[PDB]
Amino acid sequence: INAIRTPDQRFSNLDQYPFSPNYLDDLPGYPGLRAHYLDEGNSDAEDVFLCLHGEPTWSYLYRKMIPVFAESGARVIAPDFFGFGKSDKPVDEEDYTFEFHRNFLLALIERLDLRNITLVVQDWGGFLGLTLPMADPSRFKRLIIMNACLMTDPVTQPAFSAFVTQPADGFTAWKYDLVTPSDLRLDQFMKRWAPTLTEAEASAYAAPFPDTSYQAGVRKFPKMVAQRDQACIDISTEAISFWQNDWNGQTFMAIGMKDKLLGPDVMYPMKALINGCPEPLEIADAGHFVQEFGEQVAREALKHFAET
Numbered sequence: 595i596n597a598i599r600t601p602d603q604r605f606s607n608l609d610q611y612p613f614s615p616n617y618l619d620d621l622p623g624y625p626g627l628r629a630h631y632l633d634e635g636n637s638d639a640e641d642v643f644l645c646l647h648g649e650p651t652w653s654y655l656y657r658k659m660i661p662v663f664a665e666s667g668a669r670v671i672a673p674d675f676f677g678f679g680k681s682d683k684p685v686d687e688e689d690y691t692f693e694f695h696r697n698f699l700l701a702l703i704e705r706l707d708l709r710n711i712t713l714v715v716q717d718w719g720g721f722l723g724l725t726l727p728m729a730d731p732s733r734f735k736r737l738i739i740m741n742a743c744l745m746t747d748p749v750t751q752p753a754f755s756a757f758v759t760q761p762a763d764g765f766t767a768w769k770y771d772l773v774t775p776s777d778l779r780l781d782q783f784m785k786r787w788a789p790t791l792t793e794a795e796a797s798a799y800a801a802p803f804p805d806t807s808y809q810a811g812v813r814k815f816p817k818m819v820a821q822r823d824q825a826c827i828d829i830s831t832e833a834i835s836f837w838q839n840d841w842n843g844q845t846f847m848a849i850g851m852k853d854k855l856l857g858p859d860v861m862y863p864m865k866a867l868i869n870g871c872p873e874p875l876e877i878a879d880a881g882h883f884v885q886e887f888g889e890q891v892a893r894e895a896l897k898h899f900a901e902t
Contacts (some may be wrong), residue, residue: 595626597676597684598808604801605680609794610657615680621701629702630680631673632656635664641710641735645672646699648717648742649815650772650780652679654798655885659714662892668712673702675718677811679802690814692745692826695722700729712736712899716884717856718815721745725829728836736844738895739871740884741856743864744830745822751834753863757855758820764854769816778809788883837868844902845871846895850880850887872898 605611618629632653643663645656653672663670674681675695684690699722703711711734715723720742727734748755758765771783781800785791803809818826845868849861865871875894880887 595624595684595689596686597627597682599628599682600680600802600804600808604804608654608798608801609792611654611798613653613657613660618702618705621698621705623697623701624676627676627682627684629673629676629682629698631671631702632660634660634670634672635668637669639667639669641668641712642708643668643670643712643714643738644703644708644723645670645714646716646719646723647672647675647678648719648721650678650783650812651717651799651883652681652802654679655716655883656714656888658888659885659892662889662896663714666896671706671708673699675811677814683802683808683811685807685810687810687814687817690811690818692722692818692823692829696725696829699723699726703730703733709733710735712738714738714740715742716740717742717882721819721830724837725833728833728840731836731840734843736846736899737841737868738846738848738891739864739868740848740891741850741853741861741882743856743860744833744867745819745826746830746834747822747827750831751863753860757860761854765816765819768855769820772816773813776806778803778806778812780812784883788881788886790886834867839869841869843870844899846898847871847874848884848887848891848894849874849876850882850884851876851878852880853882853884855882 613632616631616633647655652674656672660670677683743754781796784799785796877887
């Protein structure tokens with residue numbers, strides 16, 4: 595597995611990321627690759643919030659949510675996918691697959707022996723994260739879901755495929771923005787798709803990527819939304835049955851109402867598939883990256899769980 599590592603100095607000037615690095619080595623199926631994860635709050639806590647990022651972000655996306663979860667007395671784990679953040683980065687797009695990313699998550703959960711998990715998901719964090727509990731249901735207790743769905747086939751859930759082609763300024767534009775430029779500047783991309791970001795914050799999304807050779811993982815993600823392999827279809831379809839029939843944990847859903855990708859059109863169908871999912875918190879002004887209203891969401895989720 596040909597991979598490269600982002601030099602440490604890229605992360606020297608980060609804004610509002612005071613969180614210390616932790617690393618995992620020799621995960622099964624990932625020889626030679628080192629993964630970065632945050633591990634915050636009481637290490638001996640009973641509850642763990644497992645926060646999974648998506649495209650084209652990293653654990654930085656959860657910077658506003660982590661302190662809220664930590665202050666409630668829980669442990670918080672926020673891994674960077676291989677190809678992202680401070681994790682090692684395979685150089686060939688062909689190495690990135692649904693299974694590559696999924697099995698990594700499973701290996702990390704097992705290695706850290708995470709239990710009493712509150713799964714917190716958005717975007718690819720959800721497409722992958724939502725398929726984890728069925729593999730080891732006894733480890734998972736709660737779900738916080740922000741703009742996410744399952745990557746099933748278009749016949750099974752047309753809502754989880756339609757967004758790919760309409761509106762033009764939605765996933766079509768998103769994918770175009772990510773896969774076409776020779777010089778992909780994620781600070782500019784993130785300022786576009788998360789317009790509340792300051793330049794300091796936006797710069798943190800470019801930090802992992804000195805140049806295009808570090809971005810194979812970034813390029814591959816949208817191609818996997820557009821073209822879903824058989825493993826992805828199968829696993830995502832199995833997950834539907836889990837959420838509908840097997841899940842009996844507590845759920846909190848938050849929707850970025852202005853999201854052109856995975857807004858109400860996608861999230862209401864998703865709500866219906868999750869047994870016991872309450873009415874969603876509708877954030878009227880939020881877009882795809884619901885986490886930029888992250889403090890609010892984390893605080894409201896905690897209240898909801900404490901209240902029921």
